[PDB]
Design a binder for this molecule. Structure first.
Ligand SMILES: [Cl-]
Ligand SMILES: [Cl-]
Ligand code: NA
Ligand code: NA
Length: 129
C-alpha cells in the first residue's frame, strides 16, 4: 500500500507515535517519506548483505528475521515480511523499540540527513487530526 501524507499521519497517531519518546508526529511522517516514499512494500539491500523492510526500512541484521542474514539478532521477534503489510502495526511496534535503544531517531539515516533540524511540522500541515 502507498499511503497518503495525511492518511499515514492519522494511522501513526492512532498507534501512539505522536510525541513518542519526544518525537512529534511530523518527524515520523518525514522519515517515512524519505525512507520508503510512503510505500509499505519497499525493500532495499545493504552492502553487508542485510535488507531494509517496509515503510520505515527496518534492517534485518538487528530487528527482524528474513532467513538470509547470517548472525542477525531479530530483536523485534518478527519475520521481516510482516513489516511489508498494509497494516503498519508491526512496523510501528518495532520502531518504538528502535527509537528507545539510546540513539533516538538518529537510527534512521534519512531522518538525520533530511528531517533533523527542519520544519517537520509542515509534514502534517493541513491534515485533519
Ligand atoms: Cl510535528
Ligand atoms: Cl540520507
Ligand atoms: Na492523505
Ligand atoms: Na535478523
Amino acid at each position: 500500500k502507498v499511503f497518503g501524507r495525511c492518511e499515514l499521519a492519522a494511522a501513526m497517531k492512532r498507534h501512539g507515535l505522536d510525541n513518542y519518546r519526544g518525537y512529534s508526529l511530523g518527524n515520523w511522517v518525514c522519515a517515512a517519506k524519505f525512507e520508503s516514499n510512503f510505500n509499505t512494500q519497499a525493500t532495499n539491500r545493504n552492502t553487508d548483505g542485510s535488507t531494509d523492510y517496509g515503510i520505515l526500512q527496518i534492517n534485518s541484521r538487528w530487528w527482524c528475521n528474513d532467513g538470509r542474514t547470517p548472525g542477525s539478532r531479530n530483536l523485534c521477534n518478527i519475520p521481516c515480511s510482516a513489516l511489508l503489510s498494509s497494516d503498519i502495526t508491526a512496523s510501528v511496534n518495532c520502531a518504538k523499540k528502535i527509537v528507545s535503544d539510546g540513539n533516538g531517531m538518529n537510527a534512521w539515516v534519512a531522518w538525520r540527513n533530511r528531517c533533523k533540524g527542519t520544519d517537520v511540522q509542515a509534514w502534517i500541515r493541513g491534515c485533519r487530526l
